[PDB]
Symmetry: C2
Subunit: 96 residues, 2 copies
Amino acid sequence: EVVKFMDVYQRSYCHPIETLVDIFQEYPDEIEYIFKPSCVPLMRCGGCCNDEGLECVPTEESNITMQIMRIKPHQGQHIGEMSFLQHNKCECRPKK
Amino acid sequence: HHEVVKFMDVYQRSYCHPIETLVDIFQEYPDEIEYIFKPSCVPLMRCGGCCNDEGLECVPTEESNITMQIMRIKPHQGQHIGEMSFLQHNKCECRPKKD
């Protein structure tokens, strides 16, 4: 059975959506370490806009600290805090 | 303000599972050059998340098709809503990378 048009657009439109982020892509300055887990769930702007001209971007941003096993391989390793950017409010806005 | 997310709840929530993820139609279908689409983009269940070992990688096992209605526009020429099928990952698990 079809996912009805109205219900697509409504559900796609530019909102914050829980998204999984590999720590090492987001932070490549964490070169000495692997992380456990490798990856975290973060609220992040995603989705279509009315016009192909617009793009879906944050307006309010905030911090979530989390505890992350930090491993220097074959060496010391320790759970530690790590702070991450989360997008609380999104809106469609012009590209450049 | 807001308490730190406890390790248990990280791991549990990160681990390789299907997660609703938003996918540009033009990436999924790149042969569709003469059309824009409304939306630009659709919600599809897709494998995402950590694996215990940097050796493993998080991959689909069961896959399925989900038909959805999409405004198809040829610009300066208007349009037609029509059906369009999409790939969705129903079941994921961590498995070794040969890559």
